[PDB]
From a paper:
AcrB is a key component of the AcrAB–TolC multidrug efflux system, responsible for exporting diverse substrates across the bacterial envelope. Structurally, AcrB functions as a homotrimeric multidrug efflux pump that undergoes a conformational cycling mechanism, with each protomer adopting one of three alternating states: access (loose), binding (tight) or extrusion (open). This asymmetric arrangement enables unidirectional substrate transport. In the present model, the trimeric architecture and domain organization are consistent with this established mechanism. While the global fold aligns well with the reference structure, local differences were identified, particularly in flexible loop regions and surface-exposed side chains. Notable deviations were observed between Asp711 and Glu693, which reside within the PN2 subdomain of the T protomer.
Author numbering:
A (entry chain A): 198 to 247
B (entry chain B): 445 to 493
C (entry chain B): 51 to 197
D (entry chain C): 51 to 148
E (entry chain B): 248 to 345
F (entry chain B): 592 to 936
Amino acid sequence: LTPVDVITAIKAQNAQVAAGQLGGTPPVKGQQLNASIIAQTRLTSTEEFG
Amino acid sequence: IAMVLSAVFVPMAFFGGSTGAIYRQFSITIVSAMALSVLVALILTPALC
Amino acid sequence: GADAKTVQDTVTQVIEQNMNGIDNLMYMSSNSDSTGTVQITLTFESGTDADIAQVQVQNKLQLAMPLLPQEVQQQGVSVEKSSSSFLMVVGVINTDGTMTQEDISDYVAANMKDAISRTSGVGDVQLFGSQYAMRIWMNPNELNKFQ
Amino acid sequence: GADAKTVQDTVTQVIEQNMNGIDNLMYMSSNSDSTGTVQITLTFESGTDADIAQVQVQNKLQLAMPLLPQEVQQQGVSVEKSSSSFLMVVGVINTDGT
Amino acid sequence: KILLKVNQDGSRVLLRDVAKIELGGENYDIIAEFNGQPASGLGIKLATGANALDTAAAIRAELAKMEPFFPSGLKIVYPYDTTPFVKISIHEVVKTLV
Amino acid sequence: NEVTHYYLTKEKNNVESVFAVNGFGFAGRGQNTGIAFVSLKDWADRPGEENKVEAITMRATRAFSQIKDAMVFAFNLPAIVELGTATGFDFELIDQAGLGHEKLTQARNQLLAEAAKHPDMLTSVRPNGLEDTPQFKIDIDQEKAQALGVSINDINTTLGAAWGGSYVNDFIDRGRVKKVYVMSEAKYRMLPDDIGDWYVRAADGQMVPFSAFSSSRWEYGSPRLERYNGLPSMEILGQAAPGKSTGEAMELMEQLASKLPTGVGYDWTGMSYQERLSGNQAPSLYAISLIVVFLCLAALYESWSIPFSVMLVVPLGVIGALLAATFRGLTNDVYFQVGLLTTIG
C-alpha cells in the first residue's frame, strides 16, 4: 500500500454530499408530500474513523 | 427665561440608545427655536413697536 | 440541494470560526434553513459609520473564502448592509395573459434590474421572480435505453 | 478567450448592477480591446473621499467576482485610482549602444 | 444538436433525444399574483440616508421614458407605496401651522 | 386565493388591490409560508370609524378563524419596522456544553411547560421557531458499491444532479449571459419508490439500480437552525401580563433561568439587550435637570428662597395633562412626555 491511497480513501469517505429534495419545484399537479433528503455525514468518532 | 428653557430642554438630548435619536431630535428642534426666538424678540420687536 | 445539516456544517462553521478581531461588534445571529440558505446578521453599536464595518466583514469573508466548497463559491457569497424591510414595491402586469409569469419575471430582471441600481439612495433591490435560464430536464428511461 | 461580442456581453452587463452601493455616484463606462484588455472607469462627484470609494468599489465587485466564471479568478484584476496626466517621464539610454 | 454519443452503429443521439431542453428559470419557489393575474414585483430597499420625495420622481421619469420600449399590454401597478402618506401628513402640518 | 377572493368580494368598498406572494413568508422561507399585501382606496371615500385599518384587521382575523387547517394572521404595519413591542422580550437559550440537538429542544419544552404555570405573570409566551419535521434518510453501502464496481463520486454526482440540480456553465441568449441548469423531470422525483428507477453504469458495462446497494428510512429533524455568538441557541418570545411592569417579570425570568439543567445558559437579544444596556438613567437625568434649573433660577434672582416660589408650580400644570390623559385613554409615550415638558416650561 501507499500513503496516496490512504489520503484518497480518507478524502472520499469523509465528505458531505447534497441529495436534493422530495417533491421539489417545479412540482407535478396532485402532490401531498414534501420532505428533505439526507445522503451522508462526516465521521464523528475515532472508532468510526478506524 | 431663555436660560431656564435651555436648562429644562437640553438634558433630554443626552439620552442614549435608539430612543436617544428621537429624543435629541425634539430637544434640538425646541432648543434652537427658543434660542432664536429670544434673540429676535430682543432685537427686532422694539424698533417695530 | 442541501438540508440544514450540510449548510450549517460546511458553510456556517468556517465563517463563524474565521471571524475574529472586528471592532465595535455588538452581537451576531446566524440562521440556517433547509432550502440551502445561510444568513448571518452582525449588529454593531449605534453611531458607528457602516462602511468600515462592511469592509471589515467583507475582508474576513475573503479570508475565510478558500475553505468553502466549490458550489457555494460558484453561486456567490453576498455581503451587504441591512435596512428597512420594504420601501416600495412596483409590479408589472400584462392584460393579454397569453404568456406565463416566467416571461414577465425574466423581462423585469433583464431590462430593469440594472437600471434601478443606478439611482442614488437605493441600498439594494430584490426581485420576485427568476431570470431566464436554459434548463435540461432529463428522462431516466432514455438513459436506460441508450446506457 | 472571449471575442468582441462575448467579452462585450459577459463583463459589463453582469457587473452593471454591482455598482449600486456608493452614494454621490455619476456613471461608469467600459472599453474592451482586441488585444484582450478590458477597462472599466467609474466616476463620482467632486468631493467624495477617494479611498472609501475605491475600497467600496472593491468590496462591491466582490459581489459578482464569484458570480462570473472561474476565468475571472485566475487572471487577476487591478483596481486603483486613475489620474489623466503623466507627472513626469524619465528615459534611460546607453551611449555605448552595446 | 449537441452531440452526446454515437454508440457503435452511428446512432448519433443528441441532447434532445435523451432530455428535453427549454428556457425557464433557475428557481420556482416564489410566485406572485395581483388580483389573481400573474405578475412580478420589485422590492426596493432605501439607503441609510436618502430622500423620500426625491429618488422616486427620477424613477417615475425613467419609467415614462422606457414606456415606448415595452410590448403591448405591459403596464405597472403600485401595490405598496408610502409617498402619499408623507405628502398628506406634511400638508396637514403646514395647514394647521397657517 | 381564498384570501384574495374574500378581500375582493366582502370588502369591495374598502380594499382596492391585493398582492399575494407565495414562497417568501416572514417566519421561515419554505414552501409552507406565504404573505399578502393589501392596499385600501383613497381616504376621501372611506368615511366613519368602521373603515380604519384597525376596524378592518380584527374583522378579517375573526372571519378567518373558521379555517381549522391553516394559521392565518392579519395585521397592520408597526410604526417602526426595526423595533417594536417594548413590553415584550426576546429571551434566548444557549448551549454551552455541546449536549446535542434533542437535549436543547427538551430543555426548551421543559421551560415552556414550567412557564405555563404562571398565567398571572406571563402572557403569550410562545416560540418563534418551527417544530421538528420528517425527512428522508438514505444510506449508501460502501462495500456493496465497491464490490459491484461503481465509484462513490459517480453515485454522489448522479444523485445530486438528478434530484438537486446542477449549474454547468453560461451562454448568451440575446446579448446577455444566462445560466444553464441540469435537472431531472418533475414526474420522476415525487415519491420514494422511484428511488429504484435510476440506474448507474459500472466498470464492466453493467447497469445497477440504486436500491441494489442502498437503504432508506424516515427521521425527524429541525428544518431551521439558529446560532447565537457561535453557539447553538433557541429563541423564545413572550409578553408581559397586563398591569405589570417588565421589571417585575425580569426577576421571575431569572428565577426560571436559575433552575435549568447544566450546560444550558440564557441570554437576551434584540430590544431586551438594549433595555438592559440602557440602565436606570432617567431618574438621574431628571435630578440633574432639577439641580440645573434650581441653580439657573437662583442665578436669575438673588435670594435663595425666591426660586422656590417658581419651582413648586409644576404639579398645577401636571394635573391637567394627567386628567386629560385619563379622560381620553392615552398612553405614556414620547409625545405625552414632550407635552409635559412644554407645559412646565
